[PDB]
């Protein structure tokens, strides 16, 4: 890799290779954790959010990137954050 990386970039590229290693984030703000969570897949987001609940209200806009990739024909209705819509449609489609 003929690239120079600062500490932010080093940590987030390593963590962008091993998202699966994250169990509990500790106390990192989402604004720091914004890159590694955008290159991610919704099951891993469910795992992260159900181990690290305090992130939930921060990550909802992230779910939109998933929703328009998995349910591109859809839009949220009112009183529907993107996480709960994605889980409702995901379980409805599996059923």
Partner 1 sequence: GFVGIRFCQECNNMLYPKEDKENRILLYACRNCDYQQEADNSCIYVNKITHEVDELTQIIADVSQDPTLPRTEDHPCQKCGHKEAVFFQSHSARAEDAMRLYYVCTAPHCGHRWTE
Partner 2 sequence: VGLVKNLALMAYISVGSQPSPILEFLEEWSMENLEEISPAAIADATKIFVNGCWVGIHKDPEQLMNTLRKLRRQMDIIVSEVSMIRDIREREIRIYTDAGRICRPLLIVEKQKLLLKKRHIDQLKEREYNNYSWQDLVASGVVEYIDTLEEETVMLAMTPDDLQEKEVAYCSTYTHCEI
Partner 3 sequence: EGPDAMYVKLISSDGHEFIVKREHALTSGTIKAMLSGPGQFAENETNEVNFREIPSHVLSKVCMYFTYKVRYTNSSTEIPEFPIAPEIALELLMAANFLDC
Residues that bind partner 3 (CB under 8 A): 1-8, 10-12, 14-15, 18, 21-22, 25-29, 32-33
Displacement of CA 50 from its chain's centroid (Å): 12
Binding mask 45-84 for partner 2 (x = CB under 8 A): -------------------------x-xx-----------
Query: Phi-psi category of 90—alpha, beta or left, where left has phi over 0 and alpha has psi -120 to 50?
Result: alpha
Tell me how many residues contact partner 2 (CB under 8 A).
Answer: 4
Q: Which is nearer to partner 3, 21 or 95 (CB)?
A: 21
Whole-Å CA distances, 29 to 16, 56, 85: 17, 11, 24
Cβ 16 vs Cβ 36: under 8 Å: yes
Question: Smallest distance from the beta carbon of 95 to partner 1, in angstroms?
Answer: 25
């Amino acid at each position: 890799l003929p690239k120079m990386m600062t500490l932010h970039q080093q940590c987030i590229r390593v963590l962008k290779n091993n998202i699966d290693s994250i169990f509990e984030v500790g106390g990192v703000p989402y604004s720091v954790l914004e890159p590694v969570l955008e290159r991610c897949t919704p099951d891993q987001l469910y795992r992260i959010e159900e181990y690290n609940h305090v992130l939930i209200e921060e990550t909802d806009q992230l779910w939109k990137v998933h929703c328009h990739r998995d349910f591109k024909e859809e839009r949220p209705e009112e009183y529907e954050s993107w996480r709960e819509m994605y889980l409702r449609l995901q379980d409805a489609r599996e059923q």
